[PDB]
Each structure stands twice: as C-alpha cells, then as structure tokens.
Design a binder for this molecule. Structure first.
Ligand SMILES: CC(C)(COP(=O)(O)OP(=O)(O)OC[C@H]1O[C@@H](n2cnc3c(N)ncnc32)[C@H](O)[C@H]1OP(=O)(O)O)[C@H](O)C(=O)NCCC(=O)NCCSCC(=O)CSc1ccn([C@@H]2O[C@@H](CO)[C@H](O)[C@H]2O)c(=O)n1
Ligand SMILES: CC(C)(COP(=O)(O)OP(=O)(O)OC[C@H]1O[C@@H](n2cnc3c(N)ncnc32)[C@H](O)[C@H]1OP(=O)(O)O)[C@H](O)C(=O)NCCC(=O)NCCSCC(=O)CSc1ccn([C@@H]2O[C@@H](CO)[C@H](O)[C@H]2O)c(=O)n1
Lengths: 812, 812
C-alpha cells in the first residue's frame, strides 16, 4: 500500500493546477518514481506529458511507454521555454541553484517535481556530503569546506505544504512539510469555473469578429497576457512612432509569447522594418517560436509567404536572426546586437528584449523616433535588480514621447500562488547619520540555519545584492554559503535589543593569498592555474612576480548598499570601518559578532576586481585604492573592462611592493590607451592615470626626474623644435605637428614634464586624448561637448607652454 | 536694316530646334542683344522663356518686359538642371571653360547663345588680353604669360555653321563660321512630323491604360528616355532582387529625369526602403525634382501623403536627404554617402548616381542582394573617362546576378547633332616594342593654333587624359594652354614621314622652384602662400626648410598612357626618357621637337604629387622616386591621400639634401600610422616605409646604428624582458605583451634592429600593423586573408626572434 497523503497531494495538485514536490531517498528510487507516475496518471488523462530526466553522467516497461527526455546538467540551457509533465533530478551532488531554477520552472501545474537522493542511513549526514562544485571553492590556503547550503535545503522543506519526502518503501518522514495535508472537496466542472477563465474567454469572444487581433488573441493563455496583447495591438494599430510600451514581468509569466504575438500583429498591420535587439540571439527562441505561431494563426504558408534566415556559421547555430515577409508586402524581422543602433534609421518597430540587462547608454541609443517595445524580468530567476529597472523606467519617464507600463502576474504553467514556486524562491532567495553607524560581522554558521530571524536577515541582505545585479544568479548564494574563507560584513545603525537591525550596507570579503613560492613557479611555467584565487593569481601572471602572491590579502567580492540610501555615505563608512578592523584598530553562535570581539587576520593588502565605471572608480580611489591591472577585452554582457585595485592596508609596513606594481601599470596604461582603450572617454582615462601615478608615488625610488638637454636632444631634432615653435606661434596647421604628440604626451604623463608646466584638468584630458588615445579633433570635441575650434584653441595653449619650456631649457 | 543671315540663322535654329551662336563686339552690345531678342521672339511664340545673364561684378524696356535671371560666375553651379531661352555672357576675361560648359548647355533648342566682347580695334588683339585667371598661373620664377586659349577660341568659330560674329552695327565678319548659311525650306506641321515624335507618342499611347507606367511615361520627352523608363519599370515590376540596370549617357541627355521617374515607379510599386547613394547630395536636385514630379503625376498630395526631410544644418541646405511615404505603408527615399554601405541591410532599391565617379571598392561594397540602379556620365562635361566606365562594366559583368545596360543618345533641350554643342565639344575638347619608342616634345605655340593636324593631335592627347580622370574638367585645358612654364612631352613609336605618330604616352611637366630665400622667409612667417608652386611651397612649409625651395625642379603634373596599351611598359619608358633628357644625356614652329634638338634646363630634382595607390606607388618607386610628404586628410571625392615624391635626378651632385627630407618623413611616417593612417592596409604602409627608408639611405650620415645594452636598458625594464621571454615561450597570452609592441616596432623599423633580426614581408607587415597601426588581430587577419590563429602563430615567431636577440645582447 501507499500512505494516503501521497495520492491526496497528487490529486490536490492536479485539481488546483499546482505543482507537487516529492523527494525520494534510497537505492531504488526507480520504483518510487514509477509508483508516483502511475498514481499521477491514473487520476488525470489531460496531463500525461513528457518526463524530464536530468543526470550528470515496471520501470523497464515505464521507460518504453512514456516520452522521456534526458538532459545533462550543463545542457539545461537547452530546455528553456519547454514544458514537461514531471521533472526528475538524479544527482544531488551536482544540482547547483541555477540547475534547480532552470529545471523546476519547466513543470506544468499538477505535475511532479521529483528529486532523487542516494540511500542515506540518516538525513543528518546530508549537511556534510561532497558537492561536485565544492572542488572549485577549495584552495591551497583553505582546503576544508563546511557545507551549509544542504543544511538550509533540508530545513527549507518543512516550509512547503506541497513537499513530501519519501523513502524507497514510500513512507513519509517528519521532515516533510506537507504531512498535515488534507483532501480538497471534489470539484464541479458543470457550472463552476474560475473567474480568470471566464475573463479570458470573454476578452477572446468579444474580439473574435475583428482581425487580425481576433486570430492573434486566441494564443494568449492568461488574462494579463491578453491585456498585454491588447495594449500592444492598440499601440501598433495606432501606427504612431511616438509610442513606447514596456513589459515587466517575472520569469515564466510569458513575456516572450506576448511580445512574439505582438510582433506578428505588427507584421500583419503593415510594418516593413522590424528590429529585435537582445543581448544574445539564443534568448530569441521562444519569441520567434511564438512569432511563427502567430504567422500560422494568420493563415500564412511556410516557404511561400515567409522564409526564415538562420545564422549557422557562428556559435549560435539554432538562433534565428532574420525572417522575411513577402506576402502582404516586403517585411523583415531582423535581429541586431544592442551596439548596432546605427541601423535603426528606417526602423518602424524596435523591440528590446531584456531591456533592464542592456546597459543604459545602449538603451538610450537604441531609442529613436519610432515605436519601441521593451521587456524586463524584474523578479524570479535570471531577473534584474529593482534598482536597474527603476533607473530605466525613470529615464523613460524623463525622456517621455509616450510611455506605456504593463505588468504580468499570473503564471502560465502553474496556478498563481504555487507552493513549489514559493519554496524554490526561498531556498534560492529569488525574490541615520553615517558616522553613527557601526559594522558587525555576520556569522555564517547561523545565517544559514533556517531560523526565522536568521532567514529573515538572510533574505534582507540577499535582496539588497539582487537589485545590484544586471542578471540575478542564485549560484552566488551557494558560493557565499559553502565558501571556505568567505566572510560577510554588514553595516547597521544604532539598534537596541528586541529589534533586528536594518542592513544599510553588506560587504562580502574573501581571504586570498598565502600561496607557496614553489606552487607559484610551478604555475608560472605553464598556462594552467588553480583558479582558486583571483587577485594573487592575476598579478603573479601579469607582472611575472613570484613574491606578491605569497602575501596574505582580502578580496572584496561584493559590496552593496541599500538603493534607497545610495550616495549618502554608508558604503564609504562601511569600507573605512572594515579597513580599520583589518588594520588592528579594534581590540548556536550569535548571529552578529561586533568588530571589537573577533581577532582580525594579519593582512598585508585588500583588493577588489570590478567592472570599470567612472563613479565606481571615483569611489574606490576615494577609498585609497590604486589600480594594478585593467583588462583590454571588455565584457560582452556588460561592456566594461575588469579593473583590479589593491590597497596597502597594513600600517607600519613599507608599501613599496605595491609601488612597483602601480608604476609598472601606470606607464603601461599610458600607451595602452591605443590598445582596446581608444574608446575610453578622456576624463575617465585621465582619472585612472592620476590614480595610478598616485599609487606609484608610494615608492620613493619611483619619483620622476627632471628633463635635461642631453636627453631632450635625444628625442627631438632641431627641426622638430622649429616645427613646434612655429605651431606655437599660430603659423602652422596642427596636422603637421602630430607625430610629436606621442612624445610630448609621454613626457608629460610620465612625470618628466609634470612639474615644469602646469596644466588644468581640461588641458590634461585633451593632451592625453590627442597623444596617447590618438583621437581626432571631431571625436574629442563631441566627447567634451565643445566646438571643434575651441578644442584646438585650448590645444595651442598647451603647446605654447611646452614650447616655452623647451626653449628655456635649450637656451640655458 | 540687318544682314539677311541673322534672321535666317535664327529662323533655321527655331525651325530645326537647334541652338544659334552669336558673338557681339563693341561698347553697346545691349542694342545688339535687344535687336537679336526681338528677331528671335517675332518668329516664334512657344519659345519666349527666361533670359540668363552672367557677369563677374529699347534696352530699358527690354529689361522690364522679360524674365531675366542674373547669375554670378562663381554661382553657375546654382543653375544646374534649369533651362533658359537665351544665355548671355558679359565678361570675356572671366569665362573659364567650366563656365562655358555650365552656361551653354542650359539653352533650349532654337534659342540664342550670345557672348559679349568689349569693343576691339582689331580681333587680332584678342590673343593677348589679360585673363582674370592668368594671375593664378603666374609665379615669381615665371611671370610672363602668352595667352593661347583665346587664339584657338577665335579660330574655332570658323568651324561652326551656326556661329555668327557681329559688331555694334550688326555686321557679319569674315571670321564668322556661318556666313555661308542658307534659308531652309518652310515646314508643314499639318502632316509632316519627326519620326522620333511619332515613336514617343506611340510608346506613350500604347501604355496609357496601364498604371502606374501609363502616368509615369507621360513625363519622358525622348525615345531613349521612354525606353529607359520602360526597362526600369520592367525591372521594378519584376520585383527581383537579382536585377541590376546601369544607365550610361552624356551630360544633358536626361539620366536624372529617367532615374527619378524610375524611383517614383518603384515607390508606386510597393517598395519600402529605397536608398540613393551619390558623391554629394547637391547632385540630387533634379533627380528629386523629377521624383516629386512623378509623385504629382501619381495623384499624390503634398504634406498629406508624403513629407520631405531636408538637411539644413550642414552646408548643403537645399539638398533633399529623406522623403517619407505613408500612402498605405511606410516607404522612405534616403540619401546615404557611398561609404555608408552598412545601412543597405534592408535596402530594397539602391540607386547609385554617378557610379563611375564613385571609387571601385565603394561600388563593390554598395552592391548586395537587392535591385541596383546605376548612372554614369561617360562623355560631355563633368564626365568620366572611358577607362573607369570600362572597369566598372567589366566588374559588373564578372560579378553577374543579372546586369542590364542601357544608353541615352538624343538630348532634350536641343536637337540631336546641334551645331553649338559640336563647337563647345571641340574648343573644350569634351569628347610596338617599348624599347623602340622615342620621346618628342610637343610645341605649345602650334598645338593650339587650330591647324587640322595640330587640332587632331590635340584632341588625341586630350582624349587620352579624359579617360584617366574620375571627373572631366575642361579648366585643365586652359591651364595647359596658358601656363607660363608648362611643358608637354609625348611618347611615340617609330614613325615615318606623311603619318602623324600615335601618342602612346603623354607627360605634362611643370617647371617649379628658383624662389628667393627672402620670399621664403616672408611666407614662412605667415600662413599665406603664393600658391604658384606646389612641391617647393609644400616642402618648405612642412619641413620649415628655407633652402629647398630655392632649387630648380620639375613637377610631373599629369602622366597618362593609352588605356589599350596600359601595363605594357610605355609609361616607365617615357619617364626614363624624360629623366635622361633632364640629366643632360641628349646633346610656324614644328609641332614636334625631338629631345636631341632642344637644350634641357638645369634641374636638381623632379617631383610628383598624386593620390596614393598601391599600383601608382609601385610604379613611382620603380621609377626611383622617394616620398617626402603624405597628407593625413583623405580626399573626399577620391578617398586617397596626397603623396609627394621627389627624385634627385641630377648626377654628379650630392643627393644629401633629399636624404634629410626622406629620413624626416620616414621616422615621422612610422608612428604617424596611428594618425589618420590606421586605415592603411599593412602591405601598402610597409611598402611606403621601405621606400622612405631607401630614400633616407642616400645620406650616409642617416645610416642606422646598432643596438647596445646601455640604450636597451633605458627602454625595457628587466620585468619587461621577463614578460617578453615568457611570451616567446608560449606561456603567456599575447594581450599582456602589447605596450611593448610600439617600442619593438619602432626599434625594428627605424633600423636599429633591422640588421640583427631577419623578417620576411608578411612578418614585417604584421609587425608594422600591430606596432604602429595598433590594429586588432581580427582586423589584421581579415585584411591579410589569414585565420586569426595563424596571425598570432606567425606573430609569436617574430617575438621568438626579438627575444633571442635581446637575450644574446644582455648576456654578452
Ligand atoms: C557604490 C556603492 C559602494 C555604494 O555607494 P555609496 O553608498 O558608498 O556612496 P558614497 O557616499 O559612499 O560615495 C559616493 C561615491 O559613490 C559612487 N556611487 C554613488 N552612487 C553609485 C552607484 N549607484 N553605483 C556606483 N557608484 C556609485 C559615486 O561615484 C560617488 O558619489 P559622489 O558623486 O562623489 O557623491 C555600491 O557598490 C553600489 O552602489 N552598488 C553596488 C555596485 C556593486 O555591486 N559593487 C561595487 C564594486 S564590487 C563589484 C565586484 O566586486 C563583483 S565581483 C567580479 C565580477 C566579475 N569579474 C570578471 O567578469 C567575469 C567575466 O565572466 C569574470 O567572473 C571576471 O573576469 C570579476 O573579476 N569580479
Ligand atoms: C600608371 C601609368 C603611368 C601608366 O602605367 P604604365 O604604362 O607605365 O605601366 P608600366 O609597365 O610602365 O609599369 C607597371 C606598373 O604600372 C602600374 N600600373 C599599371 N596599370 C596601372 C593603372 N591602370 N593605374 C595606375 N598604375 C598602374 C602598376 O603598379 C605596375 O604594373 P605591374 O603589376 O608591376 O606590372 C599611367 O599613369 C596610368 O595608367 N593612368 C593615369 C594615372 C594618372 O593620371 N597619373 C599618374 C600619377 S600623376 C597624378 C597627378 O599628378 C595629378 S595632379 C594633382 C591632383 C590633385 N592634387 C591634390 O588634390 C586636390 C584636392 O582638391 C588638390 O588639387 C591637391 O591638393 C594634387 O596635389 N596634384
């Protein structure tokens, strides 16, 4: 027999269209899965869909009778947009939170999400079991790893009413969170129906006579989807290039289907050029599938009324890039990259998928005098933080021609308020005067113990980081929980007993370094790297230095503040407090440990690796950080170059080891502006150069030397001096004296000419651009918001200062 | 009374629809013009159009009764595409051939082209009268100018049967070429009609029922125009993106009108994106006027069915750049520059106006998988040489999807075979073993004497230069004729008496130099230049040298060979013969003077200024020329940088004055590749650098020195050497060692490392690109037609040679 609660839970899930969670432990989980599929199928006939099975690397009749799809863990990106009647996970040791989010959301309501666990003598051994991902966290310095993610995972089950844990013998355990489940009253489909189903069929039958909306509204499955289609069509039918409709919805709500049917409606309404801009064409799979579904519903014929152009040469073979329409009239659905805004001159409809994840300048450039459709995932898996969506909406409101804001709430595959969706959104967390504040260290042994106060505080800090993330990734939660040396610091205001403090700033610090010199030389003779550390293993490779990585240091993995309290001084105060704590200025575990009650580790430096940005760089420089490295190949999804800043926090020790690194980086950066850096704005490059020089000034031996006649004559021939003097007098065109620009720029920005001649910020920026970035006058004028004549007018005054110094130098 | 031949000629012109030429001499030409307008108007009533009057800076009733348009000589570009019933030219001293061509072609058949000459005691004083343009030819070295253009102008009249020369008293002179004119028999318009007029009305009434061709064929005025419209519409109605129709016709035949009505037909046929690519939007004035005429004939309404977008911010205010159509669907007529081929992704119809004048790579890029319309002016004023049109047609035939070739012959404003058009196409000339050949000097005193043999030979050489010219300019004829020091050299094969030799190569040499040092210093202290000379006044400004321009030199203004005999060795042989002639190797004027019968001038150098091109540079370098200067701003109409090459022809004299210039240019060019030169192909830049180094080797003191440890340690720190050695071993990514690339490239290409390490052509080109041009691996791989991996694979082998040399240098 079987426990009554298993068929009861399955029946409740089938009737209420909600998912059911089952966890099987033992060595013969196949029998349990077969018996759970038989029970699920015996009560309902309209849900017998395919079964998804995921592994890293009776029953015999069961496999040969039902459609079973096998998917690898690394191939879970291939099942995006599908829908399966029951999902199976085989290897616990491999399910990262990314895998769980990707593989659970693709189950229709009433199905079963079955997770198989290996036979265990006591569930109490789950908290210490070898993750296949733990191998990446461990390092030579820190080898042991205490698994805390599994601890919270097992405890989270008790908070889900649809989650049942069963054994090989099909017996419920007390850990199960749905042992108190009760049968629901039988339904009556003769007259009783959900109000949503009545509303949808009403909004469908009302517009059935009209075309093409009548035939393109029979594809929507939710009321919110129908309303989204209605407003999209009422903006398309308006045929006004002064309209802009944005669609923000959680993952799985059906943004792609609504936008695809809207694109089909735009095609049917007589639109010639339609452009879809997305970060990657592989995201445009379900969208184009629903565009094709709308075309089919519009009585179009394949290969006779439309041809599909698919890009096979690059990596994304399956990606659709172009669709041609030649039935009503020549129409094209072209996919362009977000950086290709130069092709939107004749754009009639530009649809920006995942507009939140697109960098803000790219979104600003993609908008024009046409009709713009926008999509954003503001919650759920792969979502965007609330801060970025708020910034985008604020920009749209400030610029607006006309902006329309619609939202989807009701999911498609499962009923609203699904229990399993609630649990997987809790386990993966997928949804005062600055001087008065104090910093506390958050203990990770209790923060992941699923205590109600601990869980509430964990959700608080997690949500803070969520907003500060162009794309949400729940793997960072596992990295934070199971890392061997990651420390979490939070900044709270003055708080009294009985009230949980409100986190205004959260700092995650990772301990790095203490790598043996033998390992350094072993790695430096090859290209392979342990990849455990970042700042040491990167400097030791870039500078070919075998002494830096043997130090002890801290990497600030993530520092985020409350978006409502940003730019008020909380982040800088938290950073200063952390630095002072690491400088030895402070002399059931409790969740919060004050900084004055734990002994800091002896650290020689603190470092950070982050995407370059003028505001971020200004903040880090104000925090006494100096650059050591700057990547040349910009990040494809972000558009920013990785920059590494290191601070010599330890006092009473010579900060000369960092002086050499800063000086080496400073001079390299000077002429690296012609290599993958030509695109940098002049002001940003000037600030980075100034910061690198300030860092290089730590070493007294790196102080610049004066310029003498003996070395000057080795650089400029007397005819070059004559040309410079002629230009300074205004008797020569600036194009003639232009190969001397690299030499003068290098002389000034390496310190030889810095003391002799005084240049302001604008003159320094123009000199840097024209000398090291090799920019034109037009580009420099546009970047600096100055007329072309004024750039040269202030450029001659730079020459009238260098020429005078050179003349006074040669004469005396 | 009036001479009978004046009303007779006017009546013949009115009846035959041919223009009439009248030249008036005296101080009261107003009376003659009034009496010629009265006579013209008294016989015909359907031609009383506006009168065009051109000046540099009875009759009273005449001005206030007829529409008179006044146009300045510098503003004659503003009357392109118009049509006037009678043209008047007031100032002889200002009518350049460009003005004559621009102002004569805008007269309808049967009108009068009246040229006013100041009262002259004897027409014999015309050959010596002060041109307002002569001031530009004269120079300090050569001041006197003998006017030969006026000489041929006066004699050319006798070859025109419709040209009458009259005085203030209206008396015909023997110089008149139409004194033997006789009255034509009166016509009969009741039944007799021209076959062309019957053919046109037949091809119109046949398609009257059909639309939109029926309403868009009533705008054509010639049979050839109607056929061009028919084939354009039959290619548009075909709606095939595998069609390409080119239209080659002389100036004034009506290419613009046919193409405009074709664009209107394409709009009416349901084309969404239509792009018109032209060298300048001001040429797209009559084309868009006829597009608008076709729209009006298609019953479109202004400001309700189409809106016109005109670019007012730039210089071309009147230029139309965009036309929007919203009749049933959004259609657009966008003007793009020829270098904007990246916007033709959705192009449904790309119409290339003046395709011959567009550089060949730009035309190759503008063509795609759509319908392409092409226009070319292969004859007449502002035309293109036959060689360029032949190259374009050959490229089209070799690439062809489908190519259609149509031609227009019959002009619009005047009858075919017009007499005045014949004369203005003669006055302005607007239409063997290599070792066995010999070079002859063509005397300019008899070449412009209008002798039949002299005129035939002048037309021969002129036609040779015409083909070698992206845009024909008849001002070069006046410059050749009236220049004070221009010498013409021609290359002919073995020829016997009684037969005029066939010119296989024509060389035009201009004598330059001998500028006083006082004038050099006077000009060098300002920006103003006499502009008489080019090579001296350019080197003396770029190099700030006060001794070069005082030499004596020759500038090869134009060297062209027969396009049928190109790349066979005639040009190089002619150049070598000219150089030997100037090196003193040869020890009713006759038209041809052998090189052994005239004393060459003592010349120190021979130079040439030309648009840079790999083939042209290779030819000049083979001719022992070395560069001295290279412009940064490429020519807008051509896309090529001006390069100046100077050869030290004189033997027995030290060529060290040029060694300094070549070395200064060579070292500057090295790092100037990052300034307006980044776009140069690697091979071309390498060849230019090699040629500049070969030129700099003339001075023994410019020989490169070895590389020593003392100077090497001043460039690379030991950590830089460690990084280079690590990269050479393949243990480091190539991105790390990239700021050392400028230093290594400069060391190798300035000669210090040239002897120590041996590099092939490909390695040298890659090193030059990556070091001095700062190109990426992808761009270099695409330019060199090699995979990206192979570029780096051969790039590491460059480093494995430099690193070994550096190690052997530091060790010992
Ligand atoms: C700025 C805050 C501190 C709070 O700012 P705060 O409260 O403190 O304001 P405050 O008064 O104190 O100072 C006033 C000053 O702040 C400035 N400011 C003001 N407002 C803002 C603002 N909104 N934003 C920014 N600055 C602002 C302003 O410039 C100035 O304002 P003023 O104009 O002077 O007044 C806080 O970070 C925040 O906002 N937002 C969170 C940003 C965040 O998340 N991390 C921050 C840096 S960490 C990134 C990592 O470390 C990630 S790991 C990683 C990832 C990938 N990769 C590579 O890429 C991968 C490729 O596959 C691969 O893995 C690897 O290769 C890698 O290596 N490592
Ligand atoms: C090449 C020929 C000698 C006959 O060639 P040739 O018969 O001799 O052939 P050959 O056997 O002897 O040698 C075999 C070698 O010839 C090569 N090759 C073979 N075939 C061709 C080919 N088709 N084309 C080219 N090379 C070819 C090949 O690379 C190789 O062939 P291989 O592959 O080695 O066998 C002849 O020129 C010709 O073709 N066509 C006429 C080109 C022409 O007209 N001038 C030539 C240079 S002058 C330009 C001025 O001087 C104009 S003034 C001015 C204008 C503006 N500006 C500035 O711009 C303005 C801005 O407003 C402003 O005014 C000012 O700032 C200024 O400063 N000055």
């Amino acid at each position: 027999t079987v426990d009554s609660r298993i068929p009861t839970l399955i029946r409740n899930g089938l009737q209420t269209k909600k998912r059911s969670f089952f966890v099987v432990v033992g060595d013969h989980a196949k029998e349990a899965i077969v018996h759970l599929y038989y029970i699920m199928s015996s009560m309902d006939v309209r849900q017998n869909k395919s079964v998804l099975w995921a592994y890293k690397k009776p029953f015999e009749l069961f496999i040969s009778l039902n459609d079973i799809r096998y998917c690898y863990y690394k191939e879970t990106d291939k099942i995006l947009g599908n829908t399966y009647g029951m999902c199976i996970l085989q290897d616990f040791e491999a399910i990262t939170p990314n895998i769980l989010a990707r593989t659970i959301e693709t189950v229709e309501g009433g199905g079963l999400v079955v997770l198989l666990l290996k036979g265990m003598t006591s569930l109490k051994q789950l908290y210490t079991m070898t993750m296949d991902v733990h191998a990446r966290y461990r390092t030579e310095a820190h080898d042991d790893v205490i698994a805390r993610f599994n601890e919270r995972f097992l405890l989270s089950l008790g908070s889900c009413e649809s989650c049942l844990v069963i054994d090989d013998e099909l017996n419920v355990l007390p850990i199960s969170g749905g042992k108190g489940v009760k049968p629901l009253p039988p339904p009556d489909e003769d007259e009783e129906l959900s109000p949503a189903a009545k509303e949808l069929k009403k909004i469908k039958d009302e517009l059935e006579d009209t075309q093409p909306i009548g035939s393109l509204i029979k594809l929507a499955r939710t009321v919110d989807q129908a309303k989204a289609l209605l407003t999209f069509v009422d903006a398309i039918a308006e045929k006004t290039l002064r309209n802009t409709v944005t669609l923000t919805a959680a993952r799985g709500r059906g943004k792609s289907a609504a936008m695809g049917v809207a694109i089909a409606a735009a095609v049917a309404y007589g639109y010639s050029n339609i452009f879809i801009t997305s970060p990657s064409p592989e995201n445009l799979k379900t969208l184009f599938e629903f565009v094709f579904k709308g075309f089919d519903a519009l009585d179009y014929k394949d290969h006779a009324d439309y041809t599909i152009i698919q890009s096979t040469n690059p990596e994304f073979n399956k990606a659709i890039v172009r669709v041609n329409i030649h039935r009503n009239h020549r129409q094209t659905i072209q996919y362009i990259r977000p950086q290709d805004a130069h092709v939107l001159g004749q754009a009639e409809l530009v649809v920006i998928d995942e507009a939140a994840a697109i960098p803000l300048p790219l979104v600003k450039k993609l908008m024009g005098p046409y009709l713009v459709f926008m999509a954003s995932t503001i919650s759920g898996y792969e979502g965007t933080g609330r801060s970025l969506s708020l910034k985008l909406i604020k920009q749209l409101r400030e610029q607006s021609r006309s902006l329309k804001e619609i939202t989807l709430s009701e999911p498609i595959r499962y009923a609203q308020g699904d229990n399993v969706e609630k649990w997987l959104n809790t386990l993966l967390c997928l949804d005062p005067d600055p001087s008065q504040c104090e910093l506390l260290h958050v203990n990770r042994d209790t923060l992941f113990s699923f205590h109600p106060v601990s869980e509430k505080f964990l959700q608080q800090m997690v949500a803070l980081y969520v907003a500060s993330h162009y794309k949400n990734s729940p793997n960072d939660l596992q990295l934070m929980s199971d890392a061997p040396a990651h420390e979490l610091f939070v900044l709270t205001g003055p708080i009294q007993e009985g009230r949980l403090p409100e986190p205004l700033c959260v700092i995650q610090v990772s301990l790095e370094g203490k790598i043996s010199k033998q390992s350094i030389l072993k790695s430096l003779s090859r290209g392979q790297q342990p990849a455990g550390d970042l700042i040491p293993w990167l400097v030791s490779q870039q500078f070919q230095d075998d002494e830096f990585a043997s130090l002890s240091g801290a990497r600030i993995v993530r520092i985020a503040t409350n978006p409502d309290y940003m730019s008020m001084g909380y982040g800088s105060k938290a950073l200063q407090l952390l630095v002072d704590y690491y400088e030895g200025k402070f002399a059931l575990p409790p969740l919060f440990s004050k900084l004055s009650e734990r002994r800091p580790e002896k650290l020689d430096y603190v470092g950070v690796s982050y995407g370059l940005t003028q505001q971020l760089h200004k903040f880090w420089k104000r925090a006494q950080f100096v650059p050591v490295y700057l990547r040349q190949t910009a990040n494809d999804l972000t558009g920013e170059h990785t920059c590494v800043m290191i601070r010599p926090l330890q006092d009473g020790n010579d900060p000369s080891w960092l002086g050499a690194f800063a000086a080496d980086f400073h001079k390299r950066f000077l002429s690296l502006l012609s290599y993958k850096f030509r695109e940098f704005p002049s002001i940003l490059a000037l600030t980075i150069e100034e910061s690198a020089n300030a860092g290089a000034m730590l070493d007294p031996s790196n102080a610049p030397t004066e310029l003498t006649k003996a070395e000057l004559d080795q650089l400029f021939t007397p005819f070059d001096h004559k040309r410079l003097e002629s230009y300074a007098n205004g008797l020569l065109d600036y194009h003639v004296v232009l190969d001397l620009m690299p030499t003068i720029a290098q002389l000034y920005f390496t310190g030889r000419l810095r003391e002799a001649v005084k240049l302001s910020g604008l003159q320094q920026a123009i000199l840097l651009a024209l000398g090291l970035q090799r920019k034109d006058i037009d580009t420099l004028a546009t970047e600096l918001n100055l007329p072309g004549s004024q750039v040269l007018a202030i450029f001659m005054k730079i020459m009238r200062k260098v020429t005078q110094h050179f003349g006074a130098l040669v004469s005396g």
